[PDB]
Each structure stands twice: as structure tokens, then as C-alpha cells.
Amino acid sequence: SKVLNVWAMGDEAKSLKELAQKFTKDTGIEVKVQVIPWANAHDKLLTAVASKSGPDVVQMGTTWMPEFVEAGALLDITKDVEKSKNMNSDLFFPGSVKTTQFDGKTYGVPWYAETRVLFYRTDLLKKVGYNEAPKTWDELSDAALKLSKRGKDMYGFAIDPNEQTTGFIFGRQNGSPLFDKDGTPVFNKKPFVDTVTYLDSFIKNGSAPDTDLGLDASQSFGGDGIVPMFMSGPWMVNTLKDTAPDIDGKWATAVLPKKENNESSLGGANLSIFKYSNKKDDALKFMDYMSQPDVQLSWLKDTNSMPARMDAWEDDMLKNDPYYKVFGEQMKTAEPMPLIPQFEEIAQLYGKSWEQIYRGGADVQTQMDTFNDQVEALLKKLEHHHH
Ligand SMILES: OC[C@H]1O[C@@H](O[C@H]2[C@H](O[C@@H]3[C@@H](O)[C@H](O)[C@@H](CO)O[C@@H]3O)O[C@H](CO)[C@@H](O)[C@@H]2O)[C@H](O)[C@@H](O)[C@@H]1O
Ligand SMILES: [Mg+2]
């Protein structure tokens, strides 16, 4: 009734819950935090739109901002944040801000940022003649295959078939804009087709698993390094520091290997107010409280998470930590996924087409033709609804 309902996601939700207790002590505003896995959160959000009932404050994945702004689900808080000391846009990285601003209006406040980098076993790489991380597509491919030739049940790299960013990150790296100047999708043109060919090459030559082996990171990346390289974000630095003592000083991160460029994705999450909330004032206090820079830095540093706020990267410990150095370097050129309202549907269509390739053995060009037509059909639909 007067309890403030917050929907949060992943491991970061634990930090939000703990900080919500100081909030309630200082304000008397009781808070109830619902934790939703990232793999269910999209369904849950769609349901809340359709029924017009949901939380008061919602953690929003950056890639879903366009969709839910479009759907009328997030409150225009432009007036409230442009004035605040701790929620004004100019504190945050412009890539993070692009995920909150649509048609001159602001629909949330960046809570944390992330980008994806290469994780690698330094000892295993040296064993196959690499004293440094692979720095090119050709190097990554070469090192992976040398690593998978150690033996049966031993690989060189992983491609996560459920990761929305992967195909698109590599596509940009090979010069594909994903969508051309007109918004026409170009997944069936050569830059993207050769991208998918390249990713599939790891699966076909046995350097990347073609199924879920069911191992946690410590069992796959640690020990003798069944999977000795992979791509992920800050949350995995945290995980590996806590769960893989056996490989202390035998792994590192590095910026992504380059093809035409080594651009990564820019993600993370925003805090937003659900447009149908009857506790808008309370929600905004909670947002403001969660944006105090010291409060933020406390949990971000603890978790090796990347701040979306710029002056936070001036902190002595962030500047000098080797994991933050690599993240910070990668973030310089990281770009959000296409900030379009059908992003998730498109990423799930990619997933299906990827699976047809890597598991079904479909032809890449033929599958990309099919995929691109699917995407064109979706975009044309949206345009008819708009015009
Ligand atoms: O796609 C939604 C949202 O994800 C945000 O990444 C968070 C990450 O979640 C990943 C999933 O997005 C991904 O589908 C699966 C695929 O195997 O793997 C991850 O779980 O979880 C981390 C730990 O909670 C978060 O730090 C991370 O933010 C992404 O940042 C965001 O831009 C995107 O909208
Ligand atoms: Mg092998």
C-alpha cells in the first residue's frame, strides 16, 4: 500500500536490496525488491505493460529502453532529473545517456554500465606461443584452434548462443553497420555474412563447444582450462575472483581482438519509474538516494562493476585496478546495441538463425537471407503502425 515495489535483476539486485535498507532507515519508506533473472525479465516486463501493473521502480536493461519507452511504460522524468544534483545527464557517459533519452525526453537514470572484453588463461596461451592476448580475428582463431588441439574435451574459445550481443559485436568489427542509413537491415550482406561464417568456424573446427557443457566458470576456465578464453563483462571478473582461487595470477582480461575495429557493446542498466505508479514521489526519492556517488561507488567497487557516472572513474582504486583499466579502455569505443524498440525480438531471431547454423548445419548466406527478411518484415510492421 505504501510499500515501494522495485523490480531488480541479476547479482546486482543484492546490492540494491542492501542499499534499500539504509534508504528505509533514513526515510521511513518501506521497500520491497523483487529479483528477476535476466532470462525472464523481458517476459515479465511485457506482462506488466499488458496489464498496466508492475513495480514502482524498475531496473531496466539498456537494450530494452527503446521498447518500453515506446510502449508508454516508463515515466518522462526529464524535469525531475535535469535539476537534480545526482541524476542529471551530464554526469554520465554519453553512450549510457543515449540509452535514457528519446525525442528530447529522459526516461531513466543510469545505474551501472558494462562492456564485454576477452578473458584468457595467460599460462595456457603462452603454452601455444601467445605471450599476449590474441589481438586480431586471425589470432583468436589460431590460438583457439591450437588450444583445442590439446586433446579431446578441450577447447579454445566459447560462443554463448543465448548472448544477444555476440553476433552483432563481431558484425560491427567486420564493418557491418547492422542497419544501413535508411534503417534497412544488412545481415545478409557480406560483412555480416562473413562474421557469422567466422563465428561458426570455431564450432565447426571444434574450438568452441557446440553444446552447453554444464560447467560453471571455475570448472571451465580454471583447472586445466577446458575453455581457456571467452567474452564477458565485469560480473565475471567478480565471479572468477571469488570462485577460482586455483588460477590466481594465471588469467587476465584484454580488449577484444580487432578485425576492422575491436568495438564492443555498451550495456548495463538504468533505474526508471513505471508510468502507472501511484508512488511517483517516493520512487524518485529512491532513485535519487541510489544515485548518491558514494553509495554507488561502495557497491560498484565491491563488485568490480563499471560506473556509468564519469567522475567515478577518477577514483584511485578504479584507475589503477587491472580489470578496470581494460574495461575502461574498451569502453572508450563501446557502442550500445541498436537502440530500436524491436531490439530484443531481433536478437532472439538472430539466436534462432545462429542455432540453425551451428546446430542445424544450415548455410550461412541462406540463413542470413532468411534472417534479414524476418527483420525487414518486423520493421515494416512497426512502420505501418507508425504511419
Ligand atoms: O539483455 C538484457 C540486458 O542484459 C544485461 O547484461 C547483464 C547480464 O545478463 C546477461 C544476459 O543479458 C544474457 O542474455 C545472458 C546470455 O547467456 O548472459 C548474461 O546473463 O548479467 C550481468 C549479471 O547480472 C549484468 O551485469 C549485465 O548487466 C546488459 O547489460 C543490458 O545492456 C541488457 O539490456
Ligand atoms: Mg579439443
Q: Is 167 annotated as a binding residue?
A: no
Resolution in A: 2.1
Q: Which long-range contacts does 347-353 make (Cβ < 8 Å, 24+ apart)?
A: 347/63, 347/164, 347/168, 348/164, 349/374, 349/375, 349/378, 350/164, 350/167, 350/168, 350/187, 351/161, 351/162, 351/164
Q: Whose CA is nearest to atom 14 of ligand 1?
A: 163
Q: Which atom of ligand 1 is nearest to the CA of 112?
A: 28
Which position has the grid cell 565447426? 204
Q: Which atom of ligand 1 is nearest to the CA of 10?
A: 24
**Which of 261, 255, 144, 260 is CA-nearest to residue 205?**
144
- 153 Cα to the center of ligand 2, angstroms: 5
> Burial of 38 by CB count in 10 Å (0-12 exposed, 13-18 middle, 19+ buried)?
exposed
CA-CA distances (angstroms) from residue 355 to 210, 360, 371?
10, 7, 12
Residue ranges lining ligand 1, Cβ < 6 Å: 10-12, 38, 61-64, 114, 160, 162-164, 233, 235, 267-269
CB–CB of 270/109 below 8 Å?
yes
Q: Which atom of ligand 1 is nearest to the CA of 347?
A: 1
Query: What gap in Å lies between CA 208 and CA 205, rounded to an integer?
Result: 8
Dihedral, CA atoms, 180, 184, 190, 191, nearest 10 degrees?
A: 40
CB–CB of 45/38 below 8 Å?
no
- 154 Cα to the center of ligand 2, angstroms: 4
Which residue among 12, 14, 15, 38 has the greatest number of ligand 1 atoms within 8 angstroms of its CB, and so is best to mutate? Answer: 38
Ligand positioned closest to the Cα atom of 147: 2
Q: Helix or strand or coil: residue 309?
A: strand
Ligand positioned closest to the Cα atom of 269: 1
CATH numbers and ranges of domains, the chain: 1-115+265-338 (3.40.190.10), 116-264+339-387 (no CATH)
CA-CA distances (angstroms) from residue 112 to 12, 300, 308?
9, 8, 5
Q: Which atom of ligand 1 is nearest to the CA of 233?
A: 26
Q: Whose CA is nearest to atom 7 of ligand 1?
A: 268
Helix or strand (DSSP H, E) at 138: helix 137-148
